[PDB]
Amino acid sequence: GAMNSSNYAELFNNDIKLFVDDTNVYRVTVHKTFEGNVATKAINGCIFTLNPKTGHLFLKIIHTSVWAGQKRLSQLAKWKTAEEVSALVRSLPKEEQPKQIIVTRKAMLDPLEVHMLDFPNIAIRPTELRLPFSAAMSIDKLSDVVMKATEPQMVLFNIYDDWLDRISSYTAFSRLTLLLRALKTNEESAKMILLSDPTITIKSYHLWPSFTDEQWITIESQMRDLILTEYGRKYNV
Amino acid sequence: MNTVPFTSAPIEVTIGIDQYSFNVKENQPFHGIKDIPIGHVHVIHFQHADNSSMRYGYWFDCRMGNFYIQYDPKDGLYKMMEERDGAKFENIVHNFKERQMMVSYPKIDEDDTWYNLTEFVQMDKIRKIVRKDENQFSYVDSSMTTVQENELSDPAHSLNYTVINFKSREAIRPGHEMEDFLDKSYYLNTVMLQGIFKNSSNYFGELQFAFLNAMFFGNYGSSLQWHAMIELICSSATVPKHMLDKLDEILYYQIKTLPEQYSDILLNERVWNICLYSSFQKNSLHNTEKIMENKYPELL
Ligand SMILES: O=C(NC[C@@H]1CCCO1)NC1CCCC1
Secondary structure, eight states, X not given: OOBOGGGGGGGGSSSOEEEEEOTTSSEEEEEEOTTSOEEEEEEOEEEEEEOTTTOEEEXXXXXXXXXXXXXXHHHHHHHHHHHHHHHHHHXXXXXXXXXXXXXXXXXXXXXXXXXXXXXXXXXXXXXXXXXXXXXXXXXXXXXXXHHHOSSOEEEEEETTTTGGGTSOHHHHHHHHHHHHHHHHHOHHHHHHHHHSOTTSOOOTTOSSOOOOHHHHHHHHHHHHHHHHHHHHHHHTO | OEEEEBSOOOSOEEEEETTXXXXXXXXXXXXXXXXXXXXXXXXXXXXXXXXXXXXXXXXXXXXXXXXXXXXXXTTTEEEEEEOOOHHHHHHHHHHHHHTTOSEEOOOOTTOOHHHXXXXXXXXXXXXXXXXXXXXXXXXXXXXXXXXXXXXXXXGGGOBOOOOOOTTXXXXXXXXXXXXXXXXXXXXXXXXXXXXXXXXXXXXXXXXXXXXHHHHXXXXXXXXXXXXXHHHHHHTOSOOOHHHHHXXXXXXXXXXXXXXXXXXXXXXXXXXXXXXXXXXXXXXXXXXXXXXXXXXXXXXX
């Protein structure tokens, strides 16, 4: 069944599961042609496949060449996503394969279902949550690897850095979704908060800065304030 | 012209014969149905006046034997039986006709409705969907489930329709996931037509038989089967031209004959809107589209 606020802690039990977000797979800039018509130009994209318990992120980079000479690209993007997720599952040892894949957009259900027919015991689930995984390209080292890629490439990251040494998965996922929600709602301000202080650095082997526990509390409060303000503006409340 | 005599009519019942129906009162001197056109299958069906649930009935073909109906007070229903003594049967039928105790199959000469609804339906195929090999006729009722329904519980009493499942290995070639799911032509033409049904006539016969079971008995699984077989054709980009033309005629008469009051439960909105307006074959079912629009514009 669908994943929602009510069964939220299922994400952090010991059944292997993956979120799959396809929102950055097919990315375009829109521009005018010499004749004054509109055209798109694709840029590199990515599938965001995330184990919310461990933080492991399988970032499959989608090179613009995959679209060459293809029609109905937004529909193709969903099947390409499902093809690559299915290939990822096949590549994993049996004991690492997920028991559930949760797609962030319901239009991925049928493509993934069809690509996963060989895994009848892997449940493909939609979600009612409005997760901010589109903002993954606001994380500088993920954006940098996607844009620099010259060919299809699968790269492994831990999106929680070392946080799990000190906090639980539930708390780690809440921090991640807060940071991403903030980056989605007002990227410039969120990034200002994260990097204002030059003395706090990002480890060469990490995605986020090396905050102490106390600094994280301050950071998290600043992201909350950001998100609430932006909202009052959105709705004039 | 053939006859299905009735031993008696002990309980009040509405009797249908093909698309016709008559009311018979408790212990009314009714003794059967004559002038049944040879050359087609037929269905004789029943709904008791006391129990408007479980419509039931029998598919038969008078070229395959002499059949009659007899009420069974233990099992509480009108049962079809075969009379193997041909002299004894002719004698009974001649006496009942002489005494004019039989209704006449009420075919108008101009009317091809029943032919058009049963064009591809064969008794030999019905008896493979309804397995009861000791009888030459086949019982169907409102409640019988299909094999596909069972997979998702008595096998002897199931409808063994061909299983169609758009998200199945059978339907989807490895490496053609997107192609085969969006264009079902290879599942239609190779898997189903060439492989399982062998020809389009057998496919159309099962489709027509499923529709008739849905209409006459309100058999829900039959209704599912009918719509699935429609959707498989409409969702294929490559369909022989003769099949599309014939499908348009098949569906036209099915929609024409459907009771107006039953369109809500017997017609699936999604399948019809997709077949007539979104699918590859949206422009290939002109007669069917025209009667649907003029008779059920609400559904669409
Ligand atoms: O490669 C690791 N991290 C993944 C990328 C590198 C930049 C950040 O994300 N870490 C390994 C090196 C030492 C520990 C394991």
